[PDB]
Amino acid sequence: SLPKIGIRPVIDGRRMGVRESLEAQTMNMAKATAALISEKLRHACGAQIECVIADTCIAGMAESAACEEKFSRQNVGVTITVTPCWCYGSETIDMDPLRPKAIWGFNGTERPGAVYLAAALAAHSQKGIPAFSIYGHDVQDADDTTIPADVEEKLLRFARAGLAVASMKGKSYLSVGGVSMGIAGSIVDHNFFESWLGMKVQAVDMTELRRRIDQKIYDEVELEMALAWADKNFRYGEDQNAQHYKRDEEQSRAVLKESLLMAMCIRDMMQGNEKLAEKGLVEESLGYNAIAAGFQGQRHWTDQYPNGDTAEALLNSSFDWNGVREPFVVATENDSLNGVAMLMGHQLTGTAQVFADVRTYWSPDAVERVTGQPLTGLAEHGIIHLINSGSAALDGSCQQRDEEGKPTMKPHWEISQKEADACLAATEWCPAIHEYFRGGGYSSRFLTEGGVPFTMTRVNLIKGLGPVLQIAEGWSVELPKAMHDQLDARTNSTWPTTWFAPRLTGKGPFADVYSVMANWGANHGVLTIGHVGADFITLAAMLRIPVCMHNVEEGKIYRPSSWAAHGMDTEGQDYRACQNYGPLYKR
Amino acid sequence: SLPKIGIRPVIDGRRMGVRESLEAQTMNMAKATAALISEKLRHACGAQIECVIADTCIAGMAESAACEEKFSRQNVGVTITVTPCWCYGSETIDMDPLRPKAIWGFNGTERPGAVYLAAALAAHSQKGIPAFSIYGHDVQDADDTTIPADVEEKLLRFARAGLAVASMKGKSYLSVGGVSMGIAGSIVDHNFFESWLGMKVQAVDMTELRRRIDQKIYDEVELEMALAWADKNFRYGEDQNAQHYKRDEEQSRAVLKESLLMAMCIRDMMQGNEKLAEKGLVEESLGYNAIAAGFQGQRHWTDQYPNGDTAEALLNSSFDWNGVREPFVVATENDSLNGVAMLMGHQLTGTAQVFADVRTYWSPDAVERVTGQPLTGLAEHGIIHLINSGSAALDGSCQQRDEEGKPTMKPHWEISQKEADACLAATEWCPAIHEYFRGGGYSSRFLTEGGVPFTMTRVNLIKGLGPVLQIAEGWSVELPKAMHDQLDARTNSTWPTTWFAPRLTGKGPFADVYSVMANWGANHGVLTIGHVGADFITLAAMLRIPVCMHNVEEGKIYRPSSWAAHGMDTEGQDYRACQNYGPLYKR
Amino acid sequence: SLPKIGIRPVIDGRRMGVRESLEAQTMNMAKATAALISEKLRHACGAQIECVIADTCIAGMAESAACEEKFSRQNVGVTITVTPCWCYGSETIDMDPLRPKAIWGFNGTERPGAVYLAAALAAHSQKGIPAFSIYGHDVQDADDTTIPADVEEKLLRFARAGLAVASMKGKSYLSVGGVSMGIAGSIVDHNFFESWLGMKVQAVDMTELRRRIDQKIYDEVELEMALAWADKNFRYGEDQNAQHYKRDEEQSRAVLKESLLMAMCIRDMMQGNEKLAEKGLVEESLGYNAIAAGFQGQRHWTDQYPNGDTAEALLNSSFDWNGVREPFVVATENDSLNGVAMLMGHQLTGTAQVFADVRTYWSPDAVERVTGQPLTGLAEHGIIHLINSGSAALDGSCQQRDEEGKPTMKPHWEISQKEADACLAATEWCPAIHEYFRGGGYSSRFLTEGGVPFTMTRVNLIKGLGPVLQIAEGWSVELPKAMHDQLDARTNSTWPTTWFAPRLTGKGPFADVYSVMANWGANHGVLTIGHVGADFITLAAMLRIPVCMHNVEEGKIYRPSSWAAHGMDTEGQDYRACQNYGPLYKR
Ligand SMILES: [Mn+2]
Ligand SMILES: [Mn+2]
Ligand SMILES: [Mn+2]
């Protein structure tokens, strides 16, 4: 069952007609908040966000304890306190240190809820339980019940990030394999998951995956559907292996058969499968309660079996042979930390997530030297070649369309079957180069459309400091055919490409495009649809994860108010604040 | 190359016949220090210990810098400073923070080396680079060159532990697989290894072990030679599987072939193998430079392939089909912490290391009730049943015998081929139980001889504290045959057994045998020949690992001098000193 | 023996075509790197920098360990890892926490070394052993082996700073005396030298210097030579003492005898002298293995003996009566911390360093008032008067000429006996003011040619924070003869002067010349030739000394990549990182 949002209507507790004349506007403010959250947001899996409201208004500790009573039978993992009047600070606040929480005070004069706001926040900072401030810019009249725009932005940005926190809590990351080729993020730090994210790590040796294929621990008929669906939809590309390693058609099919089985089995390991209990496999039917996972792959699987290019691509996509569905989060090379960003991205936007190698920086001087023509448009300052080593959510094609017909990526509940199939139509499945992937495989090649707003992210673990978050907002660019073809043939022309131009600021890591590339803390990165840096910044704050690098605009930074107290500078306050509060779940 | 010991003859710098009169004595003291070590100790692998001696006696920084220059070319991992006279304190001490160091000062009057000792230990403690103190009880005459027994004991103990520290440095732990059945020690902590031991960790998925077998990455002739040896030498035990799950003589054969192959490939992966380079297989031939390893096994491997019972038991022995050799160190269930303790065990003694489940405490009352007779002798206060899940070095039979003819375990260089054969002859190979090990395997059942002194060790990781070492000295015991048979049938009769009685002290966890069992901080322990507690304590202080439990006498506790300054109490001083100096290699 | 630079060619392990295709290009990359360093850089003492290359390319732990055995024995104090391909991250990195480390990734598409780069740094940052990123701006063709300019700059800045770190390790600072007149820097912090610089501190009482002179512990024949050379070249200036304190010739000669004997004797105390051993003085022959020194002088030496003016100036110079040579580092007033800035400067340039009082800030207003003229050219924003109290390296005249006409200070291997003679000739040796230096002495007066680019530095020790480094890049300026003669005579006309204009930046302590003066954290500073701010910064980052004050171009800040993780702000990231990683050799 899913996490719910709690709403606390707090009130001035004194009578003689004072409390009485506020009970109507106060409850109504609560119900307006819950309606707005339910109207305008869903959980990432698509279900409706349920809100829970206190039975009475809250004036002091007796009502607060009864509200908490109620909240705690109902699995609420985020709370919003609201009021249009003075109330008695520390008598009425939410003392629970785990849940993200915010307070919204009506900017009024007959109704001075934002004066409670200031005192309630002071209580919060003083008691070490930071809270988020919702305070509208414009005085509203005592009877105006319309929620303004600046308020809505904050109520929705907060609610979104908080549900992301609540939804991770209790869940698993499934490490299918160990380290891949000495990549840092594939050394899965269990304490990081437990302490900062409230998550668990289940480790399972890639042999288990081989056992499930070999011992028929999957729905045999689902495979037939998968193969049938691949025949209908899969357009193949040129095998670029040397002739003596090229595979024939019977070998080619068995490779495709195994690849799709890989996907099915991994998925089954993540979320369970009822059909296995029906076959006498009750233990294997449960799965491991994982909301994200890693597949090591290289080297020990790929030196003998088909690679996970195809399974990674499909499981991270918004659809497969069973129809459109919520994308999973499955990380190439068991890179758990790229896995966590993907997970953050998915919990924030409801959409599919593109794993990427941060492959090349193409400077203007360099692009001219080799193609004889200049980088232009959004691309003029330099450009970054993002291109995973085989696999990417097919959504990354960006053949899905928004209401003005522009190319984009959507949440699964608004993806039609025509758009799913157009994503496939943009994709050519290419044989894995044998020497690297000795057991074979099919890479999901597509070319991401131009001018699409994107946000690149990466979590890194730093000894002595801990987790940090990197963020770079930009756009995909569209290169002239001759130019694209040339830089692509030179690189890895069997692999999915996105050409990325980061927005610059003139300052620090965003002085020029080279600086963006050079300060990136790993070889992998995550691409999330939209400009969603502010959403990441907020969530990084609820998790007490410093943001070490970002290009989001000053005025959009939204953190608990006690951050302001660790400094005016928006980087210094964050390291100090994050140092102070530490990880949420244990230290 | 092996670590060398550096020996520093340090002297009074002033002349007018003073220094001149002390040169012979000072340098001959240094050479006798070297001769004693090389007579009495060997590296764990069996090689001679090499001791480098400075070119000149050292009376200041110039000569000290020359000595360090000389030592930095000869791979010296531990130093001993010796002197018969007064010398200039901080001008002469070894300043290297990383290496075990000690100071032996001659306890004379005309030759007051122990006065320098006191002053140098003070500089060491004030400059934060602790050193061990060697100071004989009895005043010695100025021309006495013989080394008293109390000084020998300390020099030898300091060197044992010192070289263990230096031999782990730079080397790998090989994790073949990941976590086994959620056991803490098999969630492998790369940082503990890097920071406390100066080791790296190579992780490898168990599918590489499969790949090596399937794709014939091994010496094909050695297998045949190994199978031959196995046929000739292996006694077999009653097959206790239910009839429908039993294997036939053909499938039995295969389980054996594969069990020995795993032995071979795990070994090959640990240390490399040049036959693979002859064979065309140049990448696999190097190995991973591991002095310890673990094999995950359950669940994911053993649910389809033969178990590591035979591999682990043979590898952990001082002998296989290629004859007597140094025993390897391979933890069952990838229990890396038991690994470390076996590592420490093997480096301190050169002997084979018994991995055990700390399985049952049998109180006096419990034994009377189930058998109708009481425990008596060394067992009268209670008994701890030590018994791994199928594997244990065959040395552990203790069929090997000393000069007195008593049962014992020995360094591999004192083991005759007659004794190797005798340990095999005391061993019966028993089929794995199918329900638990679905791909089969052969366990290694022997009963450990009684009256042999052992030391039970375990390392654990405590969040917020770091590594700790537990130690229990005691003796194996022999039960009368009806008692043994009865308790054995009740427990896991196909597995190797050792009945252990820990020496009690009346205090703490050693107040009674129950408390020893209760305080043990994991399901697994390691059993090391003799009473080697003091060696382990010394080694731990060198690694700054607090010892949270031991039963060693106060007067044998031997640690760096600056531990006295942390308190009179032998536990308080230990936690505070380790907290102060912290891990050796980093942070 | 001198530190060497170790080069680690790193490569994809997989065979079957791939590794074999890369062995040549990888190993040449490495050969070309070593070659660049040996052709373009020298040790400060002038010797050729030897490099050591792994015997094979490194693709995993076995070769990594092999490369380390070869480095361990060859005195490698710094490593540069190079690759043109993808490699297995944390299996191939250099794990030694003490050594400065660089990684160079080739920016190719077919050769994606920079992708290894990003993944190895992530591994470095994750494991707490920061490493410098060397990454070219422009993509090179697979077949291009030219090393671009931006890569060259960083290879050399890194190497230059790396050798400085390793050249200090194990060497002594010789404190000749103790505190001089309550100056902080002269209360020598032994723990600072040992923990941050890996050095030792040998203290000696000035009476020992008195002893060498009076009992003739020096080369008597050399003394006749040193006098004859002084006679020929020493141009004596005016005696500004009140008449009753001037000295006859016979008394003035005795002062010069001794001033020169102080140079010989301090030098011999620093580094030994084999002639003392010919003369039967075996103990005093060894020296104290010092690379830096300080001489207290005031108050207790100078109230009865000739001061250190002449000695300090000649020892700090690149020449004396035995010809050109490496300049020593000898701090006046035993200001050990100015000694540290000097040693740093000498290690990073091979040049003579200029010890200075930061004496007077002359504002624009104030020069108008006093001289009638205004400050023009580089002096227009303010000037700072740099005048040590009696001595300075004669190199600081800037009578040396570079390959052009221009005035400069040079590495001694590029200094002619002509340019030595010339440096002496632009210097007047003026008697010491008796009331301050009652033992007499000769001050070394010269005036520094203007327009010369200079970097000013100081190390300060801040209780509760540790060491911090101060940098100010600027120029010497020339002033009208009438303007300078007013300011000189108002101040201290017998001491060497340099007029200094610091380059401003609008913000912080570089907002105006006043603020540079006001924020300088000591009364003393060091002058180093050229704009070597960025060298100081990089060397400071290697030693984990935060920079509290600098006017260096943002874009030239070159620090280990894990600094970037501690923030975008280039100052906050430095305090956080330094606080994290702490001193190199012990905490
Ligand atoms: Mn990748
Ligand atoms: Mn077990
Ligand atoms: Mn002064």
Author numbering:
A (entry chain C), B (entry chain F), C (entry chain B): 5 to 591
List sentences quoted exactly from the publication behind this structure.
To better understand the molecular function, we determined the crystal structure of RdFucI. The finding was consistent with the result from the biochemical analysis in which the native enzyme displayed a low level of activity. The distance between the metal binding site and the surface of the substrate binding pocket is approximately 16.7 Å, which implies that the active center is located deep in a pocket.
The enzymatic approach using l-fucose isomerase, which interconverts l-fucose and l-fuculose, can be an efficient way of producing l-fucose for industrial applications. Here, we performed biochemical and structural analyses of l-fucose isomerase identified from a novel species of Raoultella (RdFucI). The monomer RdFucI consists of 19 α-helices and 23 β-strands comprising N1, N2, and C domains. In the asymmetric unit, RdFucI subunits form the hexameric formation arranged as a dimer of trimers with D3h pseudosymmetry.
